[PDB]
Curated annotation (Swiss-Prot):
Transmembrane annotation, as ranges: 188-208
Domain of life: Bacteria
Claim: 4Fe-4S is one of the keywords in the record: no
Predominant cellular place of this UniProt entry's protein: secreted
Family, similarity comment: Belongs to the hemolysin E family.
Coiled coil: none
Purpose of the protein: Toxin, which has some hemolytic activity towards mammalian cells. Acts by forming a pore-like structure upon contact with mammalian cells.
Record annotation: effect of changing R266K: Strongly reduces cytotoxic activity
Source organism per UniProt: Escherichia coli (strain K12)
UniProt keyword annotation of Iron present: no
Protein name: Hemolysin E, chromosomal
Reported effect, G206A: In strain: CH9802
């Protein structure tokens, strides 16, 4: 009959809205779970931060100051990324229990359980909008610190090019120290130079002319290359975090729009077996995303 046809269309509309609600929320979480946690090499930044003090006493005073400023700024970018992560973690801890209640409310269904499901899903979306907008502020400061680190790294590149050029007083003082050390290392046959360099007594003492400078230049180039590598990594990371932040603004707005349509949706509809599977499966998929995310970020128990 006519009434039945209308009921079926309303029920399919409800399934569509709900499935969209959940997938939209899950899609925003994946900008953290998949994009931000896996695309940017946070562990590489951590290992880098831990090693920036190596050979610190060997740099010129001016390069040393920039190295210290760069370390401090990368530490802040990491810090603010982990602050965004905790806020998202808080949303996940709540979303998982509410999505599990949602799935369970389908059992021995009735109008009260449908009304419970509707407000429970709306809370997941509302909490998501609130937490994701707070985390957006953290991502912006993470981004600003990567951008500031890029300016400092450009200034260090210019500083190191000066210091490491053959005519500078810094470079000349490095050679003079190796010459002095060559006499003390003659019996050993070995001379320990700058930035971990180890060279033979013959090279350090100039036994064959024109051979010490190139060896020293080679080692300094390796130091300069470490910072060019880091510079490339910071620039890419700044663009990727900005791209994630922009997609998050779009998805947070998409959560708000689907939340409004969910608010005017009847949940107490006749869900056939295929409709129940579609909704239950959507909710379970987001629960698995929340569990994978909280586990990566240290949660010890598994929901």
């Amino acid at each position: 009959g006519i009434l039945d046809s209308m009921a079926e269309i309303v029920a399919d509309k409800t399934v569509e809205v709900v499935k969209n609600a959940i997938e939209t929320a899950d899609g925003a979480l994946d900008l953290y779970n998949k994009y931000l946690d896996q695309v940017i090499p946070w562990q590489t930044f951590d290992e880098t931060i831990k090693e920036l003090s190596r050979f610190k006493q060997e740099y010129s005073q001016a390069a040393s100051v920039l190295v210290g400023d760069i370390k401090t700024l990368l530490m802040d970018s990491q810090d603010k990324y982990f602050e965004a992560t905790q806020t998202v973690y808080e949303w996940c801890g709540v979303a998982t229990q509410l999505l599990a209640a949602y799935i369970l409310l389908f059992d021995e269904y009735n109008e009260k359980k449908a009304s419970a499901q509707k407000d429970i899903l709306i809370k997941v979306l509302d909490d998501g909008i609130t937490k994701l907008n707070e985390a957006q502020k953290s991502l912006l400061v993470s981004s600003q610190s990567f951008n500031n680190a890029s300016g400092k790294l450009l200034a260090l590149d210019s500083q190191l090019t000066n210091d490491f050029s053959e005519k500078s007083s810094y470079f000349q003082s490095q050679v003079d120290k190796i010459r002095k050390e060559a006499y003390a290392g003659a019996a050993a046959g070995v001379v320990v130079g700058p930035f971990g360099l180890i060279i033979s007594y013959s090279i350090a003492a100039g036994v064959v002319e024109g051979k010490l400078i190139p060896e020293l230049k080679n080692k300094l180039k390796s130091v300069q290359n470490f910072f060019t590598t880091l510079s490339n990594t910071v620039k890419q990371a700044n663009k990727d975090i900005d791209a994630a932040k922009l997609k998050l603004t779009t998805e947070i707005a998409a959560i708000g729009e689907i939340k409004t349509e969910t608010e005017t949706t009847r949940f107490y509809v006749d869900y056939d077996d295929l409709m129940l599977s579609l909704l239950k499966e959507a909710a379970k998929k987001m629960i698995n995303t929340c569990n994978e995310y909280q586990k990566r970020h240290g949660k010890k128990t598994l929901f």
